[PDB]
Amino acid sequence: LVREEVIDFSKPFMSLGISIMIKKPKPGVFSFLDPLAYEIWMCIVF
């Protein structure tokens, strides 16, 4: 808006948007519990 008040813009030729860039970045010891949900384990114990 602030630029449009002093210069004329054509119709957009490419879309965009503010985004977030971060640096990029093996299961735990208890990875054997992964195949079943935590609720399933609780109900199995019960």
Binding site: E39, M42, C43, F46
Partner: protein, 167 residues
């Protein structure tokens, strides 16, 4: 049998109180559905953060129809509370009638059935939901555990009474 009877009475009262609190309160699920961090229960949804702190809505629970109806009515947690109350009544009545041994057997059966219905209610609740779990859910789980232990104690007392009678 005095220590066992005291432990059974204390455990029965503890299980009943825990299950009653779990059914009564509104800290079963820490979800995000209003969307600002609401804590839910078996019947209400209250906002833990935002412009509406302290306002509690009413949960809309509506094969699939049967699951929704059973989750809405909460027949199984309420039935577990009722069975725990009946087991406590049997425990109390067994003192007045020290010669009728089947009352303690009835108490044990009631406690085991209450635990089983608590299992069923937990299964129905978790299935109907599909976040974290609040202290009412764990109160219900602890009530199940204590109900099972107290039922074991009651059955053991029944066996002990009949063995002593046989001797």
């Amino acid at each position: 049998r005095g220590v066992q009877m005291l432990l059974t009475t204390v455990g029965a009262f503890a299980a009943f109180s825990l299950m009653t609190i779990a059914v009564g309160t509104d800290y079963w699920l820490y979800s995000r559905g209003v969307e600002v961090m609401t804590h839910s229960g078996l019947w209400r949804t209250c906002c833990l953060e935002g412009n509406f702190k302290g306002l509690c809505k009413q949960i809309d629970h509506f094969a699939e129809y049967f699951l929704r109806a059973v989750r809405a009515s909460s027949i199984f947690p309420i039935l577990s509370v009722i069975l725990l109350f009946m087991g406590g009544l049997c425990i109390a009545a067994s003192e007045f009638y020290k010669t009728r041994h089947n009352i303690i057997l009835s108490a044990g059966i009631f406690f085991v059935s209450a635990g089983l219905s608590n299992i069923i209610g937990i299964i129905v609740y978790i299935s109907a939901n599909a976040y974290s779990y609040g202290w009412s859910f764990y109160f219900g789980a602890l009530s199940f555990i204590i109900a099972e232990m107290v039922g074991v104690l009651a059955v053991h007392m029944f066996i002990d009474r009949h063995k002593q009678l046989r001797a």
